[PDB]
Amino acid sequence: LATPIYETDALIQIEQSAPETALLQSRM
Amino acid sequence: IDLGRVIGELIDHRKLIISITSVFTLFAILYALLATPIYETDALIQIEQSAPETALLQSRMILGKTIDDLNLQIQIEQKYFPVIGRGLARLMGEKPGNIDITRLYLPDSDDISNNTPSIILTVKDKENYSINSDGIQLNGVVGTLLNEKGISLLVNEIDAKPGDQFVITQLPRLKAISDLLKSFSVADLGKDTGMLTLTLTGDNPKRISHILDSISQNYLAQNIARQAAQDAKSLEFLNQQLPRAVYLQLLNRQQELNIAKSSAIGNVRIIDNAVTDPNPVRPKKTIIIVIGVVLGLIVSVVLVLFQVFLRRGIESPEQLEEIGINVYASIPISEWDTLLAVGNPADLAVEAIRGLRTSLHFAMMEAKNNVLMISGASPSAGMTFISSNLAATIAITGKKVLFIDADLRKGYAHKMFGHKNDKGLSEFLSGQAAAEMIIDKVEGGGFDYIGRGQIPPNPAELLMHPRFEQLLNWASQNYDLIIIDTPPILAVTDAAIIGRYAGTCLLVARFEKNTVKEIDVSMKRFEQSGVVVKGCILNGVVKKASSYYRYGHYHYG
Numbered sequence: 001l002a003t004p005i006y007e008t009d010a011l012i013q014i015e016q017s018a019p020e021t022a023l024l025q026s027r028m
Numbered sequence: 029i030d031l032g033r034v035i036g037e038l039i040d041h042r043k044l045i046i047s048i049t050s051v052f053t054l055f056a057i058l059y060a061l062l063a064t065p066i067y068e069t070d071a072l073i074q075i076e077q078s079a080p081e082t083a084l085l086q087s088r089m090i091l092g093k094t095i096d097d098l099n100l101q102i103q104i105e106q107k108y109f110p111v112i113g114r115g116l117a118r119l120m121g122e123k124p125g126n127i128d129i130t131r132l133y134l135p136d137s138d139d140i141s142n143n144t145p146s147i148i149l150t151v152k153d154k155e156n157y158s159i160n161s162d163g164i165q166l167n168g169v170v171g172t173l174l175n176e177k178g179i180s181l182l183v184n185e186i187d188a189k190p191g192d193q194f195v196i197t198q199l200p201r202l203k204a205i206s207d208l209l210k211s212f213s214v215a216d217l218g219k220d221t222g223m224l225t226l227t228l229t230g231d232n233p234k235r236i237s238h239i240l241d242s243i244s245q246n247y248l249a250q251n252i253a254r255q256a257a258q259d260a261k262s263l264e265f266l267n268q269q270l271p272r273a274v275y276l277q278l279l280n281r282q283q284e285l286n287i288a289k290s291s292a293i294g295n296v297r298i299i300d301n302a303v304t305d306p307n308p309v310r311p312k313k314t315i316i317i318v319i320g321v322v323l324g325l326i327v328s329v330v331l332v333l334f335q336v337f338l339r340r341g342i343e344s345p346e347q348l349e350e351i352g353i354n355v356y357a358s359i360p361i362s363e364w365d366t367l368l369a370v371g372n373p374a375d376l377a378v379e380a381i382r383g384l385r386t387s388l389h390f391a392m393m394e395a396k397n398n399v400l401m402i403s404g405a406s407p408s409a410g411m412t413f414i415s416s417n418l419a420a421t422i423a424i425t426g427k428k429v430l431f432i433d434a435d436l437r438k439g440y441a442h443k444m445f446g447h448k449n450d451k452g453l454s455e456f457l458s459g460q461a462a463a464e465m466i467i468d469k470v471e472g473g474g475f476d477y478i479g480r481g482q483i484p485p486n487p488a489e490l491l492m493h494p495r496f497e498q499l500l501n502w503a504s505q506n507y508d509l510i511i512i513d514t515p516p517i518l519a520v521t522d523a524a525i526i527g528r529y530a531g532t533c534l535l536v537a538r539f540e541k542n543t544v545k546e547i548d549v550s551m552k553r554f555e556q557s558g559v560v561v562k563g564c565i566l567n568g569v570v571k572k573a574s575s576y577y578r579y580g581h582y583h584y585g
C-alpha cells in the first residue's frame with residue numbers, strides 16, 4: 001500500500017566540482 | 029535473584045513508579061511547552077582562502093557597523109511577571125506587542141555593577157504612554173520627542189493593547205556586539221570551496237533575517253571598497269603624475285583605472301540572502317519528552333531497587349521457620365473499641381484466628397496446666413488484638429474462658445470491653461482487693477476478664493508477689509482456659525516473670541515491622557529466664573505480588 005517512489009537522474013560535465021554541489025542545492 | 033521476584037517488586041511498587049514517572053513527564057511537558065522558541069535564519073556567501081574571511085566576518089568593526097545601522101543597542105522586552113508568563117501568553121495565542129524606537133538616551137547611572145540603564149514603559153493607548161525609571165512617572169506621546177530629567181526618547185508606531193508594559197534597556201555598544209556575536213555562526217562546509225554558510229539564531233523570526241542581511245551587505249560593501257581602493261590609489265597616482273603620446277598613454281591608463289574602479293564585483297558574492305526557517309530549532313520537544321520519560325523510569329527503578337535492598341522486615345513464615353520457630357498462624361489486616369470477633373464474625377482475620385484456635389487445641393494438650401500467655405517482641409504488634417479475639421472465638425464454643433490483662437503499664441482492655449475500672453489486677457496484687465470483685469463480664473463476648481486497674485509505680489515488682497500465682501491456681505480450677513496478655517519482652521521484663529506460671533507461651537510478630545533478629549532475640553531472652561516459647565504468630569499480613577508465598581486470605585462462601 002505504500003506509495004511507490006520513482007527516481008530520475010541526469011549527468012553533468014564540469015570542465016573543480018566541490019562548490020558546484022553547493023551551487024546546485026542553493027536557493028537561487 | 030530471579031525474574032519473578034523483580035517483576036513482583038515492580039508490580040507492588042507500581043503506584044510509586046507511576047507517580048514519579050508521571051511527575052517527571054509533566055515537568056518535561058511544561059518545559060517543552062513554555063520555553064521561548066528560538067528561530068534560525070541563514071544565508072550563503074560565495075568566495076571567489078576562506079580562512080581569514082571567517083575571522084573578518086566576526087570582527088568587531090563589521091558587527092559594530094551593523095549594530096549602528098539597525099540600532100541594536102535599544103533592547104525591548106515585553107513584560108511578564110513570572111518565568112512562565114511569556115510562554116503561557118503565547119499558548120493562548122495572544123499576539124506579542126512591538127514598538128519602534130528610533131532615538132534613546134538614558135541618564136547613564138553607571139554604578140559599580142549596573143552599567144545598563146533601563147526604564148519601564150506602560151502603554152496607555154495607541155498614542156500616549158507612561159515612563160518610569162525608578163518611580164519617576166512621566167507622560168509621553170508617539171511622535172513628539174521627549175527630553176526631560178536627562179532622558180531623551182522617541183517612540184514610533186506602538187503596536188500593542190493598552191496596559192502592556194515593556195522593559196527598555198540602553199545597553200552599551202560592546203555588550204550589543206557580544207550579544208550579536210554569540211548568536212552568529214560561520215562555516216565553510218567544503219574546506220576548500222568559496223562557500224560560506226552564515227547562520228543566526230534569535231527569538232524574533234524577522235529581526236534575525238534583517239540583521240543577517242545587514243551583516244552580509246556590510247561585509248560585501250566593505251570587500252569591494254578594498255579592491256576599488258588599490259585601483260583608486262593607482263588612479264590617484266597617475267592623475268597626480270599628469271604633466272603628447274605619453275599624455276594620451278596616461279589618459280588611456282586613467283580610463284582603465286576608472287573602469288576598474290567602478291566594476292566593483294569581486295571576491296565576494298551573495299548567493300543566498302538570509303531567510304528564516306519557520307520551525308523553531310529550540311526547544312526540541314520530542315527529545316525533551318523522551319529524556320523526561322526515560323529519566324523518570326530510571327530514577328523510579330533505582331528508587332525501588334534501593335528500597336528492596338534496604339527492606340529488612342519479615343515477609344513470609346518461611347523466614348521464621350528457617351531459624352526453627354513454629355508459626356502457628358498468619359493473620360491478615362482487617363480493613364473493617366469493639367471486638368472484631370463480635371462486630372464482624374465472618375471477617376478473614378477471624379477465620380485465621382479460628383485456624384489458630386484449632387492449632388492450639390492440639391498444641392495445648394500435655395501442657396502442665398491450662399494457662400496460655402501471649403507476648404511479643406515490639407509494642408503494637410497485635411498482642412492485645414490476638415489475645416482478645418482468640419478469647420472471643422474460644423468462648424463462643426461453650427468453654428469458660430478467663431482473659432487477664434497483665435499489661436500493668438498500658439493495658440486498655442477495660443475500655444474495649446466496657447468496664448467498671450475499679451478493682452483491677454493492681455488492686456488485687458497490692459492486697460487491697462479480693463479475687464471476686466475484680467472479675468467482670470464482657471457484654472458481647474461470653475468470657476470473663478480482669479482489667480489492669482490503676483497504673484502502679486512498681487509494675488514488675490508487683491508481678492513477683494505470690495498472690496499472683498495464688499490467683500492463677502484458683503482460676504485454673506474454675507475455668508477451661510486462661511489467656512494472659514503481656515507487655516513486649518524487649519521493652520520490659522514483665523512477660524518473663526509471668527511466663528513462669530504459664531503452660532503455653534506464644535509470640536506475636538508483626539508482618540513487616542519486626543525482623544527475624546528481634547524474634548530470635550526474644551526467644552532467647554525467654555529461654556534464659558526459664559520460659560519455653562511454643563511458637564510464633566505472624567500478624568498483619570497483606571498481599572504482595574513479589575511474595576510467591578500465598579495464603580488463604582480470601583473469602584470463601
Ligand SMILES: Nc1ncnc2c1ncn2[C@@H]1O[C@H](COP(=O)(O)OP(=O)(O)O)[C@@H](O)[C@H]1O
Pocket residue numbers: 359360361362363377404406407408409410411412413414567568569
Ligand atoms: N490484623 C490486624 N488487623 C486490624 N487491626 C489490627 C490488627 N492487628 C492489630 N491491629 C490493631 O492495631 C492496634 C495495635 O494492636 P495492639 O494489640 O492494641 O498493640 P499491642 O500488641 O502492643 O498490645 C490496635 O488498635 C489493633 O486493633
Ligand SMILES: [Mg+2]
Pocket residue numbers: 411412435439513514
Ligand atoms: Mg497490649
